Structure 1
Amino acid sequence: LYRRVINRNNRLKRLIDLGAPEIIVNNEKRMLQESVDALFDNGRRGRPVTGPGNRPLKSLSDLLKGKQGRFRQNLLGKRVDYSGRSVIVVGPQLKLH
């Protein structure tokens, strides 16, 4: 997405400096707006910007939303060290503590 933003911005700079009919300049400005759109929130407007494998790309907003977002996946609950896991078996000879 950042590469798309950079490409659109550089091409718009070239169009402005060279001097082009206003239709092409307007099209480039629209592409810049849609590229920043995709960067900040992919799929919010129109069909989402898609890469290889035909899957929506993960914009900044998608990195802060839902279960898989940072807030409820890395901040609230984290994978911890000094821990393990195993099957349980009844211990009827053990004490309560």
Structure 2
Amino acid sequence: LKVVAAFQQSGNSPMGMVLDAVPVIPPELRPMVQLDGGRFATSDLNDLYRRVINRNNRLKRLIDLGAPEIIVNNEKRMLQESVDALFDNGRRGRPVTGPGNRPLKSLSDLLKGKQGRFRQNLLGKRVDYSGRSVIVVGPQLKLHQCG
């Protein structure tokens, strides 16, 4: 009754709980850099999106021929798990790992954890017009003075 009351209060709908369109984050948040000597580096999310688009075009072509349903629930199931690993790796079953058998960074990985909202914003950072050095005594000065 809490959550039925919650849909009951606001002018929302439960339509968004299922989806028929998946948004895409801007590319500079998954930027791709080449070093000197032709050394390329980028984000992990991109090939995950590639799994998404390959399954959507794969299903998308496969429907038009027609098929037995064994193929159909297979491809749709792979699609659903691709969405799931896109949002959060490791929640359902085995986590998606790549090279080195180490897990990748999903959307929640950018949000949750030791890169969180403290750890992005409230962690604090370095700025310019600053410096540091060692200190000694200035015993001839005044309070308002410093050296």
**TM-score, scaled relative to structure 2:** 0.55
Determine the C-alpha separation between the residues in 1 that align with 2:86 and 2:67. Answer: 27
- Greater Cα shift, 7-16 or 75-84: 75-84
Aligned residue number for residue 47 of structure 1: 94
Question: In structure 2, do the counterparts of structure 1 residues 73 and 31 end up closer, same or farther at CA, with 3 Å as the change threshold?
Answer: same
Q: Quick one: percent identity of the two aligned structures?
A: 100
* Cα gap change, 1:76 to 1:47, in 2 (>3 Å): same
Aligned residues: 97
RMSD: 2.4
2:101 partner SS? coil
Cα deviation, residue 70, structure 1: 4.7
Q: Secondary structure at the match of 1:13?
A: helix
- What are the superposed Cα offsets for residues 15-62 of structure 1, whole Å, 9 maximum, x if unpaired? 111211101110000000000000111111111111222211101001
Q: Give the Cα separation in 2 of the matches to 1:74 and 1:56.
A: 24
CA contact (8 A) 1:64 1:71 kept: no
Structure 2 residue runs without a partner (length 5+): 1-47
In structure 2, C-alpha distance between the alignment counterparts of 1:84 and 1:69, rounded to whole Å: 28
Match of 1:25 among 72, 78, 81: 72
Q: TM-score, normalised by structure 1?
A: 0.79
Q: 1:40 to 1:14 in 2, by over 3 A?
A: same
